[PDB]
């Protein structure tokens, strides 16, 4: 059990294939999800080659111990794909047809800048690492790859699962490694986002501006307080579910503008006691009113830029 | 050890049961659960056939590295079943009874739409991949079909553990695939829903609808406000024991629809106050008044509305 | 490597002993606890009987692979035993003395109706499945039964371990299955809610009551809705801390009645508000002193009528 | 492979030494902590004598399934430890010297009483049950007992990890067991209690005595329940980091004592102001200037006694 | 298989690399992180040497079994590394060249004193223990030793990834022991706490000092209360991210002084509000005023102190 060796000087081409079965826990903090799948390996083997009227059999079934076998890995993983080998089927010529169904963890980063409007390209980078003997090259049989029609996603809509068929052929520790990139494009669905954490947040900032329609400072500092405390509810629980970034999410931008505008409503309030206090409630009813406009018109437009700048 | 050889060109038929000893961890996020379980097989090999009398054994009993077993999975897996052989039985016609008792995590997704008072089908995937030399197609031995009384999955009754006799066979990677499907009908405890989230839920929007007997506004906006708070730790609480849907739940909905209430008795308690300051107590007052009539009418058939759509 | 043969027609017995070293883990949620102990198992192999003078032994060792011992499982667990074999002894007669020592995750559901003034009996089911040459039957060894001095189960005291002596033999998938029921007994220990939980509950109920003593309407409704919302963090808190029961527990019970105290109270202080406005605080007097008596002596009768009903 | 033969009647000595390389994840909670650790074991076994001159080498190596080695286990462990045997060495009188590196999550019950300045001895039982053969004694080789000086417990100093020499041999199920206690004397490092939990929860409650300053009721209402519900969150927050307890740690008597400190306060509060609300607010300023000596003094007073009790 | 012979007395030179393919879960709570990487091993066995021409070969592929191959382990890890060899090359002076790819979990101890702006140097520690034929010494090869460009640790930046190329060479149990330090250099990623955590908290203390433009006690009450309220949910936020530590945090520093400048402002509110009330309002304004620039003016002097201090 050695790797078989070249006619010529040509590297052996071992074909690849993926098939998912089971796609599931996608984890934004930790940017990782589980993959079940079927992985088909197809590699030319003369030394196996056999007469199938001598022998009587069109096909030949060995066990993994039997016969060679590249040492195929995943780069992106967690630790090693656990494994069960399916069927190894050996044709006349010495073609040999491998599978295996295979659960792994694999490590996948997420750009979260449009959440949680964002789309995704999941890798899974397939690898060999060449011997002494001959150099592996690692190629894509378009026909062993896809997935089931029951592969679901929580909180996620598969978009496609193709390869890209050209290796990436590099030397790592003084030996060649053909690697292959598997990409599962995927999209979020945004739906639940608006009844749980939007409208809830725009309802409450909403009931702070009806601070603009009372005189009652006493009021409007429990108005503006009580809604700012329930923003920060919003702000925390949204963090729990998101890895901290180097750069800021659409949400967490709307989230973080909001907090200048509970401010900026602080201020407000402050003024218009302060000068209703000062005997001059008509300098604070023109600020009040104005207020009524400008605190809407401001969010709405401040909204505009920042979905603009985002998408 | 290969697959038995065929009479004539008729496939291996494995006949299969499925007997449930454990029932537990059913997570409604993960939208997954555990399962321990028998799970039987048996299929003829004439290679395995005896006289009884020669013998003087009326059943052979065997190692399971000894004869031919088909590869028999699960689809709907987060990994390979943890098995331990239990018995191998051979009659003298050479009918294999294999059982084994095996421990796995099931991926079945729930339909949360009537959330807390939904039923759920859950399902087991058996499957087999047939061989080059013949075709394995599998079937259900509904005698072997069964759980043990003490089955008990927490916060769920379970109704009824049967099988879809006719396969579904189809062709898988250039061989033919037979699966069947195990369905474990489940509905939903929703008692503890009552005393812990839907009653607390409707007291403090109650709670709230007492501003329309005050005019004091600074108290109306303290009653309103905290309220509202008290519906955001329900909404928060609620939302941490389910998954994100691309769909509205029950709960959900009744959820979401109490924000448009509160929402509206802030205005309400701002109207009120406006006019009051505005010197007109009197138009104040019919708003009021007919606010102690409209929010609990206005809830009463928005929730029947609800609960026709949803049920 | 079979079982071993009936003199008469007689069942093989298997003498069993359960001797705990560590319980812990017991979660309430999962209604689970984790175990730690020895099993020693017991029977006559007739094979394996020599003569002491001859083999100049009293007794033999052997390696569990080198004999025949009977495959013993436990019913209520989630995955099967971790189990180290720590001696196999056969004396003259063939009485193997078979000791292993084993963990593993038992399956035992809990009555929390009584909760945190319960007690529970946690169920072992020991079983073995009969074999077509002969009935295996299980037997307790009640010098074998038992659980060490250091044996702590966190939040619980340790009351007995006991075995039912009489297995349950029935019929499963047409062989005899013999089971016995080891029941370790245990009462909570309910020291630690007084100071962290009712104690809390009550102190916050009774400064609610406060607002009878207050004709502040602005006051009163912070004091009873402030209240509330702390007794909505409790309840959460304890309902984190227990699973869901279609069935209504003693502390479920207690925080579910707090709630309607609380709205009643809130009735209270707006009907008293409403009163003292239509220039009639002499009616609104009579029925705030009548409060000061009647809710405490309604919240005093109550808890003795639903302490009576589940103790 | 069976242990080796007395030479007279003495029992068999197997020297034991644990040098401790890592010390992790002390749960409180669970009451349980993670050791990486060498387990060093020396025995006579006169059947592996050697000469040297004949062999060639002085010192013979062995792999664990070549040679008889004690069944060695520890006491209060989850699971068996994870080993891996680094060396089997065995001297021409036969003297064998074992060592393996081992991982193991150890249960050893914590006294929280002193709580966050307690102090506690882990423990590590080692163990040996004797066969029909021979008696099996374990001795300590204190040569071979220690830590490595990175040995760090985060939240916790090391003081010191010794052995009780003179082992603990008792008969358990008819055979002798010998247990040797080794002992990891910690100390909790208090100090981020006093900044995260300590001050915090005095200065909450020194901002509720300000109302003893103030004749507002309906602000001093606001005081002192605030403070309740930010009091309420640190005692929530210390009872999830420690577990459930049959007697009041020093922590949760300062925590429980500060209710009845609020509760009084309440009192107080409610008493100002309904005399004042009686036209005597000369009785009133005499109870509220009481107070704002009263209530620091009984603080002080009641925590020295609390302290006097618990250290 | 033993270890090689030496040819003089000189000890056996094990040249080690580590080339990371993953870095993940870094656990700052648990001072842990986890690695995914190739282990590279090359030392001189003159027994495996041959001549290439003779032979045919120039380089030989064996089986981890059938040669001698050092027992090399890592020090801070929790349990031993999962490894699966990828390669072991001999060429015919008899050097061989092993490679494993492992995966671990790394305890390295954090310094939090200046979080989150944080920089670290995360250790694996190589070692190997000496053997009585011959004393083992370990090497660094510089070439193979790396990390490739898609490793990226979550809030992290990766700086370096070298080794000290001296061995640290001391005696363990009567033994030599050659241990390795492989330094990973990493800076923590800020950005997300200066939106999430640092700007809504000092939002809310300069909320809290707009009290200082109000006469309103009660409304001042409500202002300072509920900030430092939110205050105390932003210090629990951030002590559940961080373990617990003997010495003070630069985040824990300011969390903590913040405490202070509530308190101070509930004295000044207080302060305020009695001198009004004994009928000395000049005296408060003074007061007041002199706090609307010795509120900031302290804030902002304070924690260029602390900065000083810290960094
Ligand atoms: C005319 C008043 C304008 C006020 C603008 C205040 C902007 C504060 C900028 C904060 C930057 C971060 C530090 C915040 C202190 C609160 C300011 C209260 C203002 C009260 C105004 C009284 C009416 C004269
Ligand atoms: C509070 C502020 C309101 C937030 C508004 C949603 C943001 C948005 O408009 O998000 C936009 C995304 C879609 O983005 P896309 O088409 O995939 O980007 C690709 C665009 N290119 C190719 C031009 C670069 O979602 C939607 O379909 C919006 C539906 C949700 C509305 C929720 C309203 C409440
Ligand atoms: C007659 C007044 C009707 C007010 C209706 C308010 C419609 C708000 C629609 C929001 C849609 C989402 C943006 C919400 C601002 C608060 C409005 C306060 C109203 C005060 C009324 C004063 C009495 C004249
Ligand atoms: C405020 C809203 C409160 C929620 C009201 C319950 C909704 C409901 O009416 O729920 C209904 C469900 C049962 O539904 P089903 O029989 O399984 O549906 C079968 C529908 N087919 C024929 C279309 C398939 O629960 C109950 O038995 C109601 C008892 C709970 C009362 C809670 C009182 C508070
Ligand atoms: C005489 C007054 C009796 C009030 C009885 C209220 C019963 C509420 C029953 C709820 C059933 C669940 C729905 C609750 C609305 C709040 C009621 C406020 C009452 C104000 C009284 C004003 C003084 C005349
Ligand atoms: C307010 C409600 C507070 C709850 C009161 C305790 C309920 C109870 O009465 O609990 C009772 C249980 C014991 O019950 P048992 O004897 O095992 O039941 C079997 C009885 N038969 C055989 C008659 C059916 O514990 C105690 O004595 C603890 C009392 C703690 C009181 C703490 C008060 C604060
Ligand atoms: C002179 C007033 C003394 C008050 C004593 C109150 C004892 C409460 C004991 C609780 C035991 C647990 C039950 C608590 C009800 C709140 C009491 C409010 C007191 C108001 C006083 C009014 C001024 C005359
Ligand atoms: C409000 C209550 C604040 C808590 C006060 C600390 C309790 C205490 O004084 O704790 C004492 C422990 C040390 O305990 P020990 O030396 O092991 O006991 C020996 C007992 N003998 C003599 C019986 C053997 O910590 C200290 O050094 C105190 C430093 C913490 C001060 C926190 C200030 C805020
Ligand atoms: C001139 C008033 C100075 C007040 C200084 C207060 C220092 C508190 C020191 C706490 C140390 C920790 C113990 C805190 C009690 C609250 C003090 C309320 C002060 C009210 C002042 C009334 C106006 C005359
Ligand atoms: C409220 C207080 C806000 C915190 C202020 C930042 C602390 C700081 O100044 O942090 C400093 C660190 C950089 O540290 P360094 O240069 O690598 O240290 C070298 C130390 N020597 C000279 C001793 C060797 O981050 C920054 O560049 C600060 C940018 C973030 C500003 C966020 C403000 C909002
Ligand atoms: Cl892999
Ligand atoms: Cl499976
Ligand atoms: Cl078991
Ligand atoms: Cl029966
Ligand atoms: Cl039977
Ligand atoms: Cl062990
Ligand atoms: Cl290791
Ligand atoms: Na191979
Ligand atoms: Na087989
Ligand atoms: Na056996
Ligand atoms: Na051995
Ligand atoms: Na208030
Ligand atoms: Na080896």
Same mark, same amino acid.
């Given at each position: 059990?050695?790797?078989?060796?070249?006619?010529?000087?040509?590297?052996?081409?071992?074909?690849?294939?993926?098939?998912?079965? *089971?796609?599931?826990?996608?984890?934004?903090?930790? *940017?990782?999800?589980?993959?079940?799948?079927?992985?088909?390996?197809?590699?030319?083997?003369?030394?196996?080659?056999?007469?199938?009227?001598?022998?009587?059999?069109?096909?030949?079934?060995?066990?993994?111990?039997?016969?060679?076998?590249?040492?195929?890995?995943?780069?992106?993983?967690?630790?090693?794909?656990?494994?069960?080998?399916? &069927? +190894?089927?050996?044709?006349? &010529?010495?073609?040999?047809?491998?599978?295996?169904?295979?659960?792994?963890?694999?490590?996948?980063?997420?750009?979260?800048?449009?959440?949680?409007?964002?789309?995704?390209?999941?890798?899974?980078?397939?690898?060999?690492?060449?011997? &002494?003997?001959?150099?592996?090259?690692?190629?894509?049989?378009?026909?062993?790859?896809?997935?089931? &029609?029951?592969?679901?996603?929580?909180?996620?809509?598969? *978009?496609?699962?193709?390869?890209?068929?050209? =290796?990436?052929?590099?030397?790592?520790?003084?030996?060649?490694?053909?690697?292959?990139?598997?990409?599962?494009?995927?999209?979020?669905?945004?739906?639940?986002?608006? =009844?749980?954490?939007?409208? =809830?947040?725009?309802? +409450?900032?909403?009931?702070?501006?009806?601070?603009?329609? !009372?005189?009652?400072? *006493?009021?409007?500092?429990?108005?503006?307080? !009580?809604?700012?405390?329930?923003?920060?509810?919003?702000? +925390?629980?949204?963090?729990?579910?998101?890895?901290?970034?180097?750069?800021?999410?659409?949400?967490?931008? +709307?989230?973080?503008?909001?907090?200048?505008?509970?401010?900026?409503?602080?201020?407000?309030?402050?003024?218009?006691?302060?000068?209703?206090?000062?005997?001059?409630?008509?300098?604070?009813?023109?600020?009040?009113?104005? !207020?009524?406009?400008?605190?809407?018109?401001?969010?709405?437009?401040?909204?505009?830029?920042?979905?603009?700048?985002?998408?």
């Amino acid at each position: 059990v050695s790797p078989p060796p070249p006619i010529a000087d040509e590297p052996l081409t071992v074909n690849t294939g993926i098939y998912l079965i *089971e796609c599931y826990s996608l984890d934004d903090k930790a *940017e990782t999800f589980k993959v079940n799948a079927f992985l088909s390996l197809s590699w030319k083997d003369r030394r196996l080659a056999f007469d199938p009227v001598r022998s009587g059999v069109r096909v030949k079934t060995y066990e993994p111990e039997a016969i060679w076998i590249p040492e195929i890995r995943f780069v992106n993983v967690e630790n090693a794909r656990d494994a069960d080998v399916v &069927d +190894i089927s050996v044709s006349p &010529d010495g073609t040999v047809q491998y599978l295996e169904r295979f659960s792994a963890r694999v490590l996948s980063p997420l750009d979260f800048r449009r959440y949680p409007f964002d789309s995704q390209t999941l890798h899974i980078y397939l690898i060999v690492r060449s011997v &002494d003997t001959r150099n592996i090259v690692l190629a894509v049989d378009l026909e062993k790859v896809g997935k089931n &029609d029951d592969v679901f996603l929580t909180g996620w809509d598969i *978009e496609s699962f193709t390869a890209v068929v050209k =290796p990436a052929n590099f030397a790592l520790e003084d030996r060649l490694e053909s690697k292959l990139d598997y990409q599962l494009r995927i999209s979020r669905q945004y739906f639940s986002y608006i =009844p749980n954490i939007i409208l =809830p947040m725009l309802f +409450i900032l909403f009931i702070s501006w009806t601070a603009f329609w !009372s005189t009652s400072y *006493e009021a409007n500092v429990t108005l503006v307080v !009580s809604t700012l405390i329930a923003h920060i509810a919003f702000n +925390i629980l949204v963090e729990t579910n998101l890895p901290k970034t180097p750069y800021m999410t659409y949400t967490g931008a +709307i989230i973080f503008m909001i907090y200048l505008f509970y401010f900026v409503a602080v201020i407000e309030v402050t003024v218009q006691h302060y000068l209703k206090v000062e005997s001059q409630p008509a300098r604070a009813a023109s600020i009040t009113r104005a !207020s009524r406009i400008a605190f809407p018109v401001v969010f709405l437009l401040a909204n505009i830029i920042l979905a603009f700048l985002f998408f």
